[PDB]
Design a protein around this ligand. Structure first.
Ligand SMILES: Nc1ncnc2c1ncn2[C@@H]1O[C@H](COP(=O)(O)OP(=O)(O)O)[C@@H](O)[C@H]1O
Ligand SMILES: Nc1ncnc2c1ncn2[C@@H]1O[C@H](COP(=O)(O)OP(=O)(O)O)[C@@H](O)[C@H]1O
Lengths: 194, 69, 48, 364
């Protein structure tokens, strides 16, 4: 029973010392990972065990055998990364960026409706609720049936009959992000609005 | 030439049939012959699968309404 | 300057687009404070 | 057992759980060897001046004459091969696979969904034929080599929309478990004059780089169209694209282990050169299902739906003529939807009747 006690003593000495060496490693890590990072747009990830090519914001395209000091699993092909100013290693990843039209595609997250704004469409809003939010909260009862929930509702009617208002009302009652994609605008803008 | 032996099929008569078929169509006829031979599991082509390949390739289906001609 | 990247004294970093040179992600200076720096105004960054 | 209760009362925690910080040291070591890296300039080799001096052009930058690493396969560093350069000494550090076009990337990295062959139904002759023409060269090429033919390069599946040509090709890809480019024609056309043909070139270059591969181009009726004179700028641009597709299939550079599947609803308008053999060696009629095919589609698509008591298919078959396959799957899905209007956890036969009735009315 003595040898395991000696092993406990030696392992606690090893722990006590390699705590200090791991802290020294952290200090040197920060000595490289200091502060003035340079943002780059990850073009793609390549397998070698993953390598990524990047386009730094200084209009230069570089290859990385190892993915910096950050994880390398999500690493979306387009995720902005803070790469080293000189050795160009990915110190850390940053939040995403605007994609032009989507920023132009206003959210208007608070549509401020309570179904007291829409009137005369009681059957219509009941159908909308039962088609979108009722399956949303009883998706369990849906997979019990072994069928998939409806992935999208459709409406039709003469212009100015409240089709957009009901959409805003559903967005309000579900607190769901609203995007007002246009219909006649998309037919133009050249080939590419697909 | 690279094909298997054709067990004495009338290749000269197949040639003699008047049909506006290009060299690509002849290559297709031979390729179809090989496919049919593989499908029915026999390595030596004969007149049956060669003929079926010929009909398949040069089908030239028209169905055109009779009033045109 | 650009997105504040949730500084809140825990991530005092911002995306800044140095004209045609490049974009970078930089900290503050002892002179400046977080309050007067937000998105979109003209930020005078150093050269090192 | 005096001090050996479980293990010494203290080793139980010291041996492994307080050795998690050894795995943290391992993480720190990975960080260290990532620190030591410096990254590499990437460019494309342009020419082989001699056994060592290579002309290399860096992307969006200047070109250099550079050497290569001591241990490297020089015999493969062909002109145009994307390569990596050391940032300081500017030597060929390592090779890179050819850069993939972003639209080609998104078109190639779509999951087929590993759909089995059972989920097609009523296509036995056509599925057997396409299985032959595509997969037989991909499984036993020596059989074709012995028989005396070159493996056919691809085929066409024509039929009414909803007949499952896309499904059949998607299933072929899943069975083969090979690279699969699922592109839709009329989505590769571009306003810019020379971009659609370039996209076709990039598609086939990826296909050659990633053998074995099956390019499924849907709606080939879009790009492929009897080339005709006159024509607006667009008409001609599409001809130019068809001309690239043609040369990229049967052209000077022979295709290998890259089998194409093309689906269309209007085979009659396809160009005779495209319709000629060599490029599309087979034309497959995926026609509207017969009664047997219809009942097969219903039975294979009624699987996931939970049935109680009695569910027959021949009645739906004789009462649902004209439905291709999508209409029948719609019938099944609409029956599942009908199931929760009256709040069942199952389906009934009258439910299937009213579902197919609604689907038929929508068909009208
Ligand atoms: N039933 C209704 N109750 C109250 N307002 C309505 C109703 N129907 C339409 N509106 C008014 O019409 C406008 C919405 O028109 P809508 O039909 O949604 O637009 P569009 O036809 O362009 O899609 C809103 O200003 C809304 O107040
Ligand atoms: N044998 C079949 N024929 C036709 N459609 C089918 C068949 N089996 C299943 N389907 C249904 O048809 C859909 C396939 O659509 P798709 O392949 O795009 O048709 P198309 O090839 O005519 O465009 C699937 O969602 C599936 O539910």
């Amino acid at each position: 029973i003595k040898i395991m006690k000696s092993e406990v003593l030696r392992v606690t000495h090893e722990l006590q010392a390699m705590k200090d060496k791991i802290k020294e490693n952290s200090e040197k890590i920060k000595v490289n990972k200091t502060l003035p990072y340079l943002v780059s747009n990850v073009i793609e990830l390549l397998d070698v065990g993953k390598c990524a090519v990047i386009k730094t914001s200084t209009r230069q395209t570089y290859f990385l055998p190892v993915i910096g000091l950050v994880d390398a699993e999500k690493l979306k092909p387009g995720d902005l990364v803070g790469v080293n100013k000189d050795s160009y290693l990915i110190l850390e990843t940053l939040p995403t960026e605007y994609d032009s039209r989507v920023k132009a595609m206003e959210v208007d997250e608070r549509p401020t409706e309570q179904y007291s704004d829409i009137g005369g469409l009681d059957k219509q809003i009941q159908e909308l609720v039962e088609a979108i939010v009722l399956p949303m909260n009883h998706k369990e009862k849906f997979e019990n049936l072994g069928i998939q929930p409806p992935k999208g509702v459709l409406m039709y009617g003469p212009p100015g009959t409240g089709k957009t208002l009901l959409a805003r009302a559903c967005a309000a009652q579900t607190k769901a992000t609203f995007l007002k994609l246009a219909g006649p605008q998309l037919v133009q803008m050249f080939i590419g609005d697909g | 030439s690279k094909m298997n032996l054709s067990e004495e099929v009338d290749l000269e008569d197949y040639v003699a049939r008047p049909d506006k078929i290009s060299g690509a169509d002849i290559n297709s006829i031979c390729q179809e012959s090989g496919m049919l031979a593989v499908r029915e599991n026999r390595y030596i082509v004969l007149a049956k699968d060669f003929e079926k390949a010929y009909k398949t390739v040069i089908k030239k289906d028209e169905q055109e309404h009779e009033f045109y001609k | 300057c650009t997105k504040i990247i949730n500084a809140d004294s825990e991530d005092p970093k911002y995306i800044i687009n140095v004209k045609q040179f490049a974009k970078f992600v930089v900290d503050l200076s002892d002179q400046v404070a977080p309050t007067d720096i937000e998105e979109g105004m003209r930020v005078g960054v150093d050269r090192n | 057992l005096l001090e050996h209760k479980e293990i010494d009362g203290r080793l139980k925690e010291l041996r492994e759980q307080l050795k998690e910080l050894t795995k943290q040291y391992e993480k720190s070591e990975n960080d260290l060897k990532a620190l030591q890296s410096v990254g590499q300039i990437v460019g494309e080799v342009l020419k082989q001046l001699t056994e060592e001096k290579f002309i290399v052009k860096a992307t969006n930058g200047p070109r250099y004459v550079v050497g290569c690493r001591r241990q490297l396969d020089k015999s493969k560093l062909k002109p145009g091969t994307r390569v990596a350069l050391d940032m300081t000494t500017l030597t060929i550090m390592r090779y890179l696979p050819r850069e993939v076009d972003p639209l080609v990337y998104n078109m190639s990295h779509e999951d087929p969904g590993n759909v089995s062959y059972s989920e097609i139904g009523g296509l036995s002759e056509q599925i057997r034929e396409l299985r032959e023409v595509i997969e037989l060269p991909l499984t036993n090429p020596e059989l074709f080599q012995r028989v005396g033919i070159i493996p056919p390069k691809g085929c066409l599946l024509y039929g009414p929309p909803g007949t499952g040509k896309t499904l059949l090709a998607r299933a072929v890809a899943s069975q083969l478990d090979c690279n699969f480019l699922k592109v839709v024609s009329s989505s590769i056309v571009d306003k810019y004059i020379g971009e659609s043909a370039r996209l076709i070139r990039e598609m086939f270059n990826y296909a050659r780089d990633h053998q074995p591969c099956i390019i499924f181009m849907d709606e080939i009726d879009a790009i492929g169209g009897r080339r005709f004179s006159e024509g607006t700028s667009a008409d001609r641009e599409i001809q130019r694209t068809l001309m690239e597709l043609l040369n990229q299939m049967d052209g000077f550079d022979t295709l290998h282990r890259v089998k194409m599947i093309m689906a269309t609803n209007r085979p009659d308008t396809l160009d005779p050169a495209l319709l000629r053999p060599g490029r599309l060696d087979r034309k497959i009629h995926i026609d509207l299902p017969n009664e047997q095919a219809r009942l097969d589609i219903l039975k294979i698509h009624a699987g996931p739906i939970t049935k109680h008591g009695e569910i027959d298919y021949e009645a739906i078959v004789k009462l649902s003529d004209g439905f291709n396959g999508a209409d029948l799957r719609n019938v099944c899905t609409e029956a599942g939807m009908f199931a929760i209007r009256a709040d069942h956890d199952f389906v009934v036969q009258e439910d299937f009747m009213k579902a197919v009735r609604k689907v038929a009315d929508s068909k009208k």
